[PDB]
């Protein structure tokens, strides 16, 4: 299957938000936010 | 017009280890210091 | 030449929650730490 963009918390899903990034995968102290590997958000934007 | 079906996983209660624990993005956030914050007990995500 | 209605909506005074509080843009502001700017009471907006 896929990994999608989930993340452990608010504050790491604002910087998501914020920059755009959902195929970079960062981690906080315990705290973890995994990348998207399919942009398809973006790809109903595109149509 | 056929329809696909992607499957998708996605965690959520992994304990990373303090032990080797690190953060990159230090500068963009910054928790509250409570243990709520400081383990995952949750996991958002977007919807549709 | 016709008119359109759209409706609009926005909080005040919605307590978040600090125990799982955080904050992003740390380096763009930073309050005077006083409550009167650690609780929310008020709402600013931009008129027309």
Same mark, same amino acid.
């Given at each position: 299957?896929?990994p999608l963009h989930?993340?452990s %918390?608010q504050?790491?899903l @604002?910087?998501?938000s914020?920059?755009?990034n959902?195929?970079? /995968?960062?981690?906080?102290?315990? %705290?973890?936010a995994?990348? @998207?590997?399919?942009?398809?958000?973006?790809?109903?934007?595109? /149509? | 017009?056929?329809?696909?079906q992607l499957?998708?996983?996605?965690?959520?209660?992994?304990?990373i280890?303090?032990?080797?624990?690190?953060?990159?993005?230090?500068?963009?956030?910054?928790?509250?210091?409570?243990?709520?914050?400081?383990?995952?007990?949750?996991?958002?995500?977007?919807?549709?």
């Amino acid at each position: 299957a896929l990994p999608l963009h989930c993340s452990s %918390n608010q504050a790491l899903l @604002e910087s998501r938000s914020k920059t755009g990034n959902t195929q970079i /995968s960062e981690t906080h102290y315990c %705290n973890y936010a995994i990348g @998207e590997t399919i942009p398809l958000q973006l790809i109903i934007e595109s /149509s | 017009e056929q329809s696909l079906q992607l499957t998708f996983f996605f965690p959520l209660g992994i304990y990373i280890p303090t032990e080797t624990g690190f953060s990159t993005m230090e500068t963009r956030v910054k928790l509250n210091d409570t243990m709520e914050n400081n383990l995952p007990t949750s996991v958002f995500f977007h919807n549709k």
